[PDB]
Amino acid sequence: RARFVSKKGNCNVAHKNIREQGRFLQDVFTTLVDLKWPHTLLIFTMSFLCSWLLFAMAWWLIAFAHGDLAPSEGTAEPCVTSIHSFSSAFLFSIEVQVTIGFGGRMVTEECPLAILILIVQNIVGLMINAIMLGCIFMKTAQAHRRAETLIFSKHAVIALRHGRLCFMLRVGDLRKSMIISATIHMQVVRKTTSPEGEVVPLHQVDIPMENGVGGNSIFLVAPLIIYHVIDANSPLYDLAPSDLHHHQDLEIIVILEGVVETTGITTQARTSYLADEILWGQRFVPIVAEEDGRYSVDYSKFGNTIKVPTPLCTARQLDEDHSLLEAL
Amino acid sequence: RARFVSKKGNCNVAHKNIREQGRFLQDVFTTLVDLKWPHTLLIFTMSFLCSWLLFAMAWWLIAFAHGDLAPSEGTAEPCVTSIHSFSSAFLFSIEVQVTIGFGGRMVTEECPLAILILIVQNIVGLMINAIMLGCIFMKTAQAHRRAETLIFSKHAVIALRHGRLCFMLRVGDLRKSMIISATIHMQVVRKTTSPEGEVVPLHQVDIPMENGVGGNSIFLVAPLIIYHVIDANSPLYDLAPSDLHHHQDLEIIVILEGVVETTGITTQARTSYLADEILWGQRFVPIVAEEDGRYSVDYSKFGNTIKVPTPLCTARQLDEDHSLLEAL
Amino acid sequence: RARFVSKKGNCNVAHKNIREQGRFLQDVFTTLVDLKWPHTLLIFTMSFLCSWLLFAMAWWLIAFAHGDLAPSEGTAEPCVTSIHSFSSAFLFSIEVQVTIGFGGRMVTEECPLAILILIVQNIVGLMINAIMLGCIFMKTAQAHRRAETLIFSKHAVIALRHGRLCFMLRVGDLRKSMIISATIHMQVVRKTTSPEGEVVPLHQVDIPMENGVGGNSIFLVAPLIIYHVIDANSPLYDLAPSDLHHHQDLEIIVILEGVVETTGITTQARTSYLADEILWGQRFVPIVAEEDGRYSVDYSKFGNTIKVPTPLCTARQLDEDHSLLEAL
Amino acid sequence: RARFVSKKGNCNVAHKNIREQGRFLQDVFTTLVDLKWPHTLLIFTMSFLCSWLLFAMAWWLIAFAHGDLAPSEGTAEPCVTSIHSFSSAFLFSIEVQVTIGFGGRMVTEECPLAILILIVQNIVGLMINAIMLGCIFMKTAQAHRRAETLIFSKHAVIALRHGRLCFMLRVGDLRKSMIISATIHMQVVRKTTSPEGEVVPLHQVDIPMENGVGGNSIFLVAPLIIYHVIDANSPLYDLAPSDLHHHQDLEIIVILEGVVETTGITTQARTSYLADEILWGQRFVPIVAEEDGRYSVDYSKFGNTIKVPTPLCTARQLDEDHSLLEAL
Amino acid sequence: KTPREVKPPEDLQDLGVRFLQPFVNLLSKGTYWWMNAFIKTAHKKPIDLR
Ligand SMILES: Nc1ncnc2c1ncn2[C@@H]1O[C@H](COP(=O)(O)OP(=O)(O)OP(=O)(O)O)[C@@H](O)[C@H]1O
Ligand SMILES: Nc1ncnc2c1ncn2[C@@H]1O[C@H](COP(=O)(O)OP(=O)(O)OP(=O)(O)O)[C@@H](O)[C@H]1O
Ligand SMILES: Nc1ncnc2c1ncn2[C@@H]1O[C@H](COP(=O)(O)OP(=O)(O)OP(=O)(O)O)[C@@H](O)[C@H]1O
Ligand SMILES: Nc1ncnc2c1ncn2[C@@H]1O[C@H](COP(=O)(O)OP(=O)(O)OP(=O)(O)O)[C@@H](O)[C@H]1O
């Protein structure tokens, strides 16, 4: 009995034997973007090191083939001025590819092959530099830094609203930065079965949020309560108190999707509630108060609730007894 | 009695005692993007200064450990050519990291440790340069410059349309640049209460705009009027004239969300109307006229309205008297 | 009698007396992005010229204040090596800010103020370079190059479908590159009036496309036909043949919004049809044929139609005569 | 009889005689982005080569017009120091435009025209560099690397659910990286005909997915089953077993659209099923199992199904016999 | 693995209504910088019991 999604958005499911291989040479960029910072740093640094050393070996080898390390006779001019050790060729490669070019060690017309090497190293340097910079960009424009500030109470409560027994939960945003088109997809998951008999382990039913329009967008500035009204079409219409417990196959997946204000990109936070975390018969205490010329969202006691009794039977038996009391 | 959102989109709510801390080392980028220009400028400048000075101290210390400042004997060759003062090492660090490299002061093979320092400073320079450039990019691609041009009249009017009493307001876009998928979410907010008794300070009900399709997208080229038809399902169906006033707990939050034409990113403008700004019984005068071979949106007198009487009772009592007059 | 939107997406409406001013210092970037290429080019070039010349004057002035142009006595060392003309200081500024740094003219420790100037010019150079590069990026990632390939026949036809009289038009995409979430918002516009009497010049009614789901998304690969079924709720339900003509106040605004495949950004194409372009009683001839092992979209004769008669009365009178013939 | 879309998302339709031409000078960027890597590489490399050689010819010509190749008299100073061969001018151009600037060959005040050439080459170098880097960025941020991991079983099955005969298919995502706002647009396509008689070759009907809300978004973590309930409004309500076959004009286009998690951009995968691939009377075997403290999605046997009988008649005749058995 | 993270009364037990030194550092606890802030409003606005 695992959690489908962790209380912090971790999709707690392993793949175990994908058939095929990955992307030929594009998975490099995607797998590069989302990755721990020091590892990415190290990869780029070591790319620069290998690019420098490779052409360093190249220049050194060229100077040595030109017969330029031994003679120093004064007459024959080098392919590249004043290099006498592999250290020299390495300094030269760094000067070239980093576009520093001090000048004490400089390419000469005496070796057109050396000119080819220069062109090659410049092209490679620009290509690798642009790749590194595009990667560093799309990494520094990363999302899900905000997706951690989007908080959700550890518990969800049900209560009576409009004479109806509706499942609720409070949502929370901690950043003053605003999410755009914030959309809710509450989704109950269990191992359910069709009448014909087929059962699927993680079945998924999009349970609709009760919105005056009916849509799924919200406008979260002050951390509010998301809630579903349990209708005879809702799968939770057979739910009862004391049926919920950490050993009851039951879970409602909560999805929050919107656009970051500063970065036009989209992020998603996930939270889940299995049966026990769904507290029966409570109400989230209002954590907002009219401050002195302001609205005071007391973020303390954020998910703190209050217990309230209720008819301790299914919304099914709710409508049963209600019809029996109304047709009387 | 504060305004939930200012007449200019300011979410006038303080947080006051968030539990946890921020993002470990990613909040740096987000908090960096949206920030006053001179402060960001200064931060980057001072990053470059500290990066230059640190390696300046490094090079100076290396020259001094090599015993290269005192002798000038002519025989022993320096780690780096021709540096005699910390000023020299600082100029050298600037030449290196900015990739200038004049040449009068140049790295030599005599100190492999100096070669290590060179590699280190080049790597750090490229990393810091890419970070600064990614930040400057995602800052210069900033939104909400357009979100200020999206204007909204200081007042909203109600009138009779289709024999029905519908709340209205005019929207305005001042830029010829177009917003894509411009979507409206009018949302009334007050301290309302369920029948069971629970009250929430800033309750939020998405009041649906009257759209021929029913959706919430618009196509704003000429500044038009957004309006809600007040039905028995609308919370405003108990509203009456003279109930609106600046001391009546009431406010309707207006959200505009779309994609900037030039920058594929999304922006959001906010405006709000509490009870008094909701002028009762008026109509926004048509500010458009068929120009000479053109459509003349007289942006002057933009929110200027005209007073019109109306049955001065609730849409509830409207339908009451209407049913009494139709079933007669 | 102007066209609201040109047959090529031009919003043919002038603003004429916006009240306020523009964006303080952010409108620069937005107004910079969407702008004719040579003008933007020239602006950046001239920015580089002014940045070079300003510091050129700076360096020249410093050399002249140091008393470094006249003496050439050999003893006193310059602030910067070997500059003798303003041309020299200008070459030096270019070498510095472009990060070339040949070396023949080089900063010296003899003037700490010159070191300050160097730091200043490097910081300014990096800032201006990043700004220019961010602008060039968001300009080269520009949209609406695709929005021109999204073609629309010059005419729209009505016909009978499902025994119903539905307004139609063919859509066209010419690029093999795919649009994502391609969404249609047909929108009829005219100078219409409420029963209470208020008239608005460019009134706008979102006329819903007939989609099996009901939504507004399409999947355009082969150029297909968009169509509206004219119901008693459609404003076009009072339309009749011979009522359409280029002097009949009538126009239906067609909006296409989706995401470019290569660039995740969104684009919008617009086309409009006033009364005459709405051909009465025709059908777009199928321009697709099953090619040899392929689907042949004959893009030729793209908007070519075929005439078909029809009951030449309003959909109102259509349902009138239909009810009279069915209740017979 | 071709496939509309290949089993791997290829839109198997040719255009054949687009009327007009392309985009004046913007199609360059779009056509540049999506393009095979080596070709793009080569284009950029050769752009750098031509930019270098052009100014190389320029500098060489200037030195030759200055009468600077022949004399070497010692008195007259060159436009640019120490160039004697076109090879020299080419090395110089590379040093300049790549911002290396060794120093052995350096611009001098003796030729203001040479200063103009320097300014020109620097401006051109920066412009071309920014263009290349923007292109390399928007190419390295490319999508549809993920769109290949979004897998779909080679077959679709129908079965009985809720006493109803609903068309199904399993969806699959292989990356742990998450898709946001994953939306399904199943769309049946055939050569169908209105009652009035018009037939269109590739007609397209958006067949709605059965979702508890009714919308088209999903939350795909474990590869699940997408399904349509065949109602009297579904076009498939006249479908029968043994009517499906690879020579039956029939195909259901399946569209998956969402936002990549790391890159806020949107991607789309396509898959299609013609009549035979639609296996009649089966059920996809549940490939998920409760692992040891985990959910085990056995990705092996991914699309493996199991055969189950069913009433072998149309959903039409299903409701016929069902009404006959219920009204009995 | 164990942060032994926290139970800070300075913010938590305060709950948002407090006037004293603990949240302030020892430095201000000697030099009344927080009290400087407290007096800062007393110029722009007359103090009240709420
Ligand atoms: N005042 C707060 N500010 C910010 N985040 C909070 C706050 N209270 C709780 N959270 C976060 O919300 C998540 C679940 O909230 P929960 O309802 O469990 O709060 P809690 O642990 O009961 O604390 P409290 O009793 O103060 O609400 C936790 O992971 C926690 O980090
Ligand atoms: N002609 C206009 N062009 C652009 N913005 C305007 C114009 N008129 C008003 N606005 C903006 O709309 C906002 C609210 O509009 P409002 O209806 O108050 O206009 P107003 O102050 O009554 O001026 P007017 O009487 O000209 O409409 C104001 O903040 C103002 O900046
Ligand atoms: N085969 C085609 N390929 C691409 N674009 C086309 C084609 N035919 C027309 N267009 C474009 O569509 C727009 C309106 O099409 P329209 O129905 O007027 O075509 P047309 O001028 O009648 O030509 P034809 O008679 O070939 O359809 C025009 O601006 C035109 O550029
Ligand atoms: N275990 C798997 N992991 C990843 N991809 C798979 C797997 N099985 C099939 N696919 C992919 O799904 C596509 C269609 O799946 P299909 O139902 O044909 O699987 P299959 O070939 O029958 O293999 P199997 O019998 O294991 O399902 C194929 O192109 C294949 O690459």
PDB file of C-alpha atoms in Angstrom, chain B residues 175-306:
ATOM      1  CA  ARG B 175      -1.543  49.050 -27.229  1.00  0.00           C
ATOM      2  CA  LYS B 176      -2.008  48.122 -30.854  1.00  0.00           C
ATOM      3  CA  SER B 177      -0.087  44.963 -29.970  1.00  0.00           C
ATOM      4  CA  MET B 178      -2.576  42.175 -29.545  1.00  0.00           C
ATOM      5  CA  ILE B 179      -3.342  39.934 -26.595  1.00  0.00           C
ATOM      6  CA  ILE B 180      -4.037  36.293 -27.437  1.00  0.00           C
ATOM      7  CA  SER B 181      -6.682  34.136 -25.746  1.00  0.00           C
ATOM      8  CA  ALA B 182      -7.770  37.128 -23.674  1.00  0.00           C
ATOM      9  CA  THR B 183      -9.864  35.491 -20.960  1.00  0.00           C
ATOM     10  CA  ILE B 184     -12.088  37.138 -18.345  1.00  0.00           C
ATOM     11  CA  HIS B 185     -12.686  35.872 -14.824  1.00  0.00           C
ATOM     12  CA  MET B 186     -15.014  38.213 -13.007  1.00  0.00           C
ATOM     13  CA  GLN B 187     -15.075  37.071  -9.406  1.00  0.00           C
ATOM     14  CA  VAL B 188     -17.192  38.520  -6.608  1.00  0.00           C
ATOM     15  CA  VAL B 189     -15.660  38.474  -3.134  1.00  0.00           C
ATOM     16  CA  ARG B 190     -17.175  39.137   0.269  1.00  0.00           C
ATOM     17  CA  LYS B 191     -17.423  37.732   3.775  1.00  0.00           C
ATOM     18  CA  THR B 192     -20.254  35.304   3.091  1.00  0.00           C
ATOM     19  CA  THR B 193     -21.646  32.391   5.053  1.00  0.00           C
ATOM     20  CA  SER B 194     -22.978  28.909   4.380  1.00  0.00           C
ATOM     21  CA  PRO B 195     -26.397  27.958   5.766  1.00  0.00           C
ATOM     22  CA  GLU B 196     -24.657  25.693   8.280  1.00  0.00           C
ATOM     23  CA  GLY B 197     -22.967  28.797   9.609  1.00  0.00           C
ATOM     24  CA  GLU B 198     -19.318  28.874   8.579  1.00  0.00           C
ATOM     25  CA  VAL B 199     -18.162  32.288   7.397  1.00  0.00           C
ATOM     26  CA  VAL B 200     -14.950  32.950   5.504  1.00  0.00           C
ATOM     27  CA  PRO B 201     -13.549  36.494   5.355  1.00  0.00           C
ATOM     28  CA  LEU B 202     -12.539  36.704   1.699  1.00  0.00           C
ATOM     29  CA  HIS B 203     -14.913  34.268   0.071  1.00  0.00           C
ATOM     30  CA  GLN B 204     -14.610  34.074  -3.701  1.00  0.00           C
ATOM     31  CA  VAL B 205     -17.302  33.166  -6.230  1.00  0.00           C
ATOM     32  CA  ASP B 206     -16.431  33.030  -9.915  1.00  0.00           C
ATOM     33  CA  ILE B 207     -19.245  35.055 -11.455  1.00  0.00           C
ATOM     34  CA  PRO B 208     -19.553  33.976 -15.099  1.00  0.00           C
ATOM     35  CA  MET B 209     -19.412  36.486 -17.909  1.00  0.00           C
ATOM     36  CA  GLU B 210     -22.309  36.395 -20.333  1.00  0.00           C
ATOM     37  CA  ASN B 211     -20.787  35.045 -23.536  1.00  0.00           C
ATOM     38  CA  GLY B 212     -22.735  33.765 -26.510  1.00  0.00           C
ATOM     39  CA  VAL B 213     -20.707  30.569 -26.349  1.00  0.00           C
ATOM     40  CA  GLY B 214     -20.571  30.636 -22.564  1.00  0.00           C
ATOM     41  CA  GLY B 215     -16.783  30.573 -22.376  1.00  0.00           C
ATOM     42  CA  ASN B 216     -14.575  33.282 -20.914  1.00  0.00           C
ATOM     43  CA  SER B 217     -12.360  34.252 -23.865  1.00  0.00           C
ATOM     44  CA  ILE B 218     -12.791  37.587 -25.618  1.00  0.00           C
ATOM     45  CA  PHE B 219     -11.234  39.321 -28.631  1.00  0.00           C
ATOM     46  CA  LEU B 220     -10.310  42.820 -27.471  1.00  0.00           C
ATOM     47  CA  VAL B 221      -9.337  45.206 -30.241  1.00  0.00           C
ATOM     48  CA  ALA B 222     -11.668  48.060 -29.604  1.00  0.00           C
ATOM     49  CA  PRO B 223     -12.165  48.610 -25.865  1.00  0.00           C
ATOM     50  CA  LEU B 224     -15.440  46.848 -25.171  1.00  0.00           C
ATOM     51  CA  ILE B 225     -17.823  46.196 -22.268  1.00  0.00           C
ATOM     52  CA  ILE B 226     -17.672  43.088 -20.096  1.00  0.00           C
ATOM     53  CA  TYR B 227     -20.941  42.198 -18.432  1.00  0.00           C
ATOM     54  CA  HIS B 228     -22.610  39.622 -16.224  1.00  0.00           C
ATOM     55  CA  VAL B 229     -26.303  38.775 -16.442  1.00  0.00           C
ATOM     56  CA  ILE B 230     -27.604  38.553 -12.878  1.00  0.00           C
ATOM     57  CA  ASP B 231     -29.452  35.231 -12.611  1.00  0.00           C
ATOM     58  CA  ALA B 232     -30.996  33.503  -9.611  1.00  0.00           C
ATOM     59  CA  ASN B 233     -27.758  31.505  -9.466  1.00  0.00           C
ATOM     60  CA  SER B 234     -25.610  34.622  -9.403  1.00  0.00           C
ATOM     61  CA  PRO B 235     -24.787  35.754  -5.853  1.00  0.00           C
ATOM     62  CA  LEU B 236     -25.650  39.288  -6.981  1.00  0.00           C
ATOM     63  CA  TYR B 237     -29.257  38.179  -7.385  1.00  0.00           C
ATOM     64  CA  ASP B 238     -29.971  39.546  -3.889  1.00  0.00           C
ATOM     65  CA  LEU B 239     -28.275  42.861  -4.681  1.00  0.00           C
ATOM     66  CA  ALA B 240     -30.328  46.061  -4.740  1.00  0.00           C
ATOM     67  CA  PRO B 241     -29.524  49.695  -5.456  1.00  0.00           C
ATOM     68  CA  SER B 242     -28.563  51.765  -2.424  1.00  0.00           C
ATOM     69  CA  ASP B 243     -27.225  48.548  -0.955  1.00  0.00           C
ATOM     70  CA  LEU B 244     -24.017  49.380  -2.810  1.00  0.00           C
ATOM     71  CA  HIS B 245     -21.776  51.832  -0.939  1.00  0.00           C
ATOM     72  CA  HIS B 246     -18.165  52.073   0.162  1.00  0.00           C
ATOM     73  CA  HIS B 247     -19.132  50.561   3.535  1.00  0.00           C
ATOM     74  CA  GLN B 248     -20.987  47.579   2.069  1.00  0.00           C
ATOM     75  CA  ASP B 249     -18.897  44.433   2.217  1.00  0.00           C
ATOM     76  CA  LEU B 250     -18.793  43.719  -1.501  1.00  0.00           C
ATOM     77  CA  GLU B 251     -16.235  43.510  -4.283  1.00  0.00           C
ATOM     78  CA  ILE B 252     -16.012  41.881  -7.697  1.00  0.00           C
ATOM     79  CA  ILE B 253     -12.523  40.855  -8.778  1.00  0.00           C
ATOM     80  CA  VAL B 254     -11.859  41.191 -12.503  1.00  0.00           C
ATOM     81  CA  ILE B 255      -9.090  39.082 -14.040  1.00  0.00           C
ATOM     82  CA  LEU B 256      -7.696  39.429 -17.563  1.00  0.00           C
ATOM     83  CA  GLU B 257      -5.309  36.729 -18.786  1.00  0.00           C
ATOM     84  CA  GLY B 258      -3.804  36.316 -22.234  1.00  0.00           C
ATOM     85  CA  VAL B 259      -0.633  35.892 -24.240  1.00  0.00           C
ATOM     86  CA  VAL B 260       1.478  38.831 -25.360  1.00  0.00           C
ATOM     87  CA  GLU B 261       1.776  38.931 -29.133  1.00  0.00           C
ATOM     88  CA  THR B 262       5.507  39.593 -29.448  1.00  0.00           C
ATOM     89  CA  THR B 263       6.550  37.544 -26.415  1.00  0.00           C
ATOM     90  CA  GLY B 264       4.745  34.220 -26.283  1.00  0.00           C
ATOM     91  CA  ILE B 265       4.598  34.562 -22.491  1.00  0.00           C
ATOM     92  CA  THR B 266       1.381  35.210 -20.564  1.00  0.00           C
ATOM     93  CA  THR B 267       0.427  38.274 -18.554  1.00  0.00           C
ATOM     94  CA  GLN B 268      -2.385  39.079 -16.144  1.00  0.00           C
ATOM     95  CA  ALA B 269      -3.963  42.407 -15.254  1.00  0.00           C
ATOM     96  CA  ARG B 270      -6.213  42.835 -12.231  1.00  0.00           C
ATOM     97  CA  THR B 271      -8.840  45.394 -11.353  1.00  0.00           C
ATOM     98  CA  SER B 272     -11.493  45.405  -8.683  1.00  0.00           C
ATOM     99  CA  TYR B 273     -14.750  47.176  -7.957  1.00  0.00           C
ATOM    100  CA  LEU B 274     -16.248  47.469  -4.508  1.00  0.00           C
ATOM    101  CA  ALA B 275     -19.844  48.468  -3.944  1.00  0.00           C
ATOM    102  CA  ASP B 276     -19.723  52.227  -4.535  1.00  0.00           C
ATOM    103  CA  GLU B 277     -17.671  52.140  -7.754  1.00  0.00           C
ATOM    104  CA  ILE B 278     -20.461  49.941  -9.119  1.00  0.00           C
ATOM    105  CA  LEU B 279     -22.655  52.738 -10.412  1.00  0.00           C
ATOM    106  CA  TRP B 280     -26.315  51.740 -10.371  1.00  0.00           C
ATOM    107  CA  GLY B 281     -28.446  52.414 -13.416  1.00  0.00           C
ATOM    108  CA  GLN B 282     -26.118  53.787 -16.082  1.00  0.00           C
ATOM    109  CA  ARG B 283     -24.743  52.873 -19.488  1.00  0.00           C
ATOM    110  CA  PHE B 284     -21.251  53.451 -20.835  1.00  0.00           C
ATOM    111  CA  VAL B 285     -21.616  55.865 -23.744  1.00  0.00           C
ATOM    112  CA  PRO B 286     -20.343  54.360 -27.018  1.00  0.00           C
ATOM    113  CA  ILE B 287     -16.823  55.729 -27.496  1.00  0.00           C
ATOM    114  CA  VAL B 288     -16.564  54.246 -31.007  1.00  0.00           C
ATOM    115  CA  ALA B 289     -17.628  55.950 -34.225  1.00  0.00           C
ATOM    116  CA  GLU B 290     -17.284  55.040 -37.891  1.00  0.00           C
ATOM    117  CA  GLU B 291     -14.344  57.245 -38.832  1.00  0.00           C
ATOM    118  CA  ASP B 292     -13.636  58.342 -42.367  1.00  0.00           C
ATOM    119  CA  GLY B 293     -12.929  54.905 -43.791  1.00  0.00           C
ATOM    120  CA  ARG B 294     -12.002  53.722 -40.300  1.00  0.00           C
ATOM    121  CA  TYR B 295     -13.373  52.830 -36.883  1.00  0.00           C
ATOM    122  CA  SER B 296     -12.812  55.712 -34.486  1.00  0.00           C
ATOM    123  CA  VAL B 297     -12.414  54.572 -30.908  1.00  0.00           C
ATOM    124  CA  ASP B 298     -12.639  57.873 -29.086  1.00  0.00           C
ATOM    125  CA  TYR B 299     -10.428  56.861 -26.183  1.00  0.00           C
ATOM    126  CA  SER B 300     -11.292  60.176 -24.588  1.00  0.00           C
ATOM    127  CA  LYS B 301     -14.394  60.081 -22.366  1.00  0.00           C
ATOM    128  CA  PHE B 302     -13.391  56.431 -22.025  1.00  0.00           C
ATOM    129  CA  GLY B 303     -15.298  55.514 -18.883  1.00  0.00           C
ATOM    130  CA  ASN B 304     -17.779  58.366 -19.174  1.00  0.00           C
ATOM    131  CA  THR B 305     -21.283  56.981 -18.670  1.00  0.00           C
ATOM    132  CA  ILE B 306     -24.877  58.197 -18.799  1.00  0.00           C
TER     133      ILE B 306
END
